[PDB]
């Protein structure tokens, strides 16, 4: 196995994939690292099963489709690993703990978001639909843009939402347009 965490690239106690190389810290991991099961398989493991066990998974769908799915456990599986592989960039940092806002000429947002909270409401089942939890990924990116205006740095939420994305598009087959 890797000799660092595959989520933050540093060492530490890591918990070992028995299907695959990968490791992780406990928290890092998520679902966070369960507590015993040998062998474990990690969630890059887990959902490369999802789609071993039905290949059509993998056919184009329609976002507008994919958002009005249900919660069951095979998308809540997928919208774990899609918040895991946002925490996999390191400019997640910016957007992993509660933000707060006083910048001169702006006003914060009305509803504020942020990784780490996502990570709760999953970890709480709280949301019901995809759409629950792709709202509240997009809302972080959107108040992040709407708060920094013209400074350089709202290019920081553009980046993390590209990855965002991306992987969505990857991680529920998204039918490839131009
Ligand atoms: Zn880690
Ligand atoms: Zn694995
Ligand atoms: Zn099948």
């Given at each position: 196995?890797?000799?660092?965490?595959?989520?933050?690239?540093?060492?530490?106690?890591?918990?070992?994939?028995?299907?695959?190389?990968?490791?992780?810290?406990?928290?890092?991991?998520?679902?966070?690292?369960?507590?015993?099961?040998?062998?474990?398989?990690?969630?890059?493991?887990?959902?490369?099963?999802?789609?071993?066990?039905?290949?059509?998974?993998?056919?184009?769908?329609?976002?507008?489709?994919?958002?009005?799915?249900?919660?069951?456990?095979?998308?809540?599986?997928?919208?774990?690993?899609?918040?895991?592989?946002?925490?996999?960039?390191?400019?997640?940092?910016?957007?992993?703990?509660?933000?707060?806002?006083?910048?001169?000429?702006?006003?914060?947002?009305?509803?504020?978001?942020?990784?780490?909270?996502?990570?709760?409401?999953?970890?709480?089942?709280?949301?019901?639909?995809?759409?629950?939890?792709?709202?509240?990924?997009?809302?972080?990116?959107?108040?992040?843009?709407?708060?920094?205006?013209?400074?350089?740095?709202?290019?920081?939420?553009?980046?993390?939402?590209?990855?965002?994305?991306?992987?969505?598009?990857?991680i529920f087959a998204i039918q490839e347009t131009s």
């Amino acid at each position: 196995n890797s000799n660092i965490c595959e989520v933050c690239n540093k060492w530490g106690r890591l918990f070992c994939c028995d299907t695959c190389p990968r490791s992780f810290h406990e928290h890092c991991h998520i679902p966070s690292v369960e507590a015993n099961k040998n062998p474990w398989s990690c969630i890059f493991c887990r959902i490369k099963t999802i789609q071993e066990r039905c290949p059509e998974s993998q056919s184009g769908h329609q976002e507008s489709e994919v958002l009005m799915r249900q919660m069951l456990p095979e998308e809540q599986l997928k919208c774990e690993f899609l918040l895991l592989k946002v925490y996999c960039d390191s400019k997640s940092c910016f957007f992993a703990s509660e933000p707060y806002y006083n910048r001169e000429g702006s006003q914060g947002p009305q509803k504020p978001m942020w990784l780490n909270k996502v990570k709760t409401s999953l970890n709480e089942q709280m949301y019901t639909r995809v759409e629950g939890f792709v709202q509240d990924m997009r809302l972080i990116f959107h108040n992040h843009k709407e708060f920094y205006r013209e400074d350089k740095f709202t290019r920081l939420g553009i980046q993390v939402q590209d990855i965002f994305e991306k992987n969505f598009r990857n991680i529920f087959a998204i039918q490839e347009t131009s």
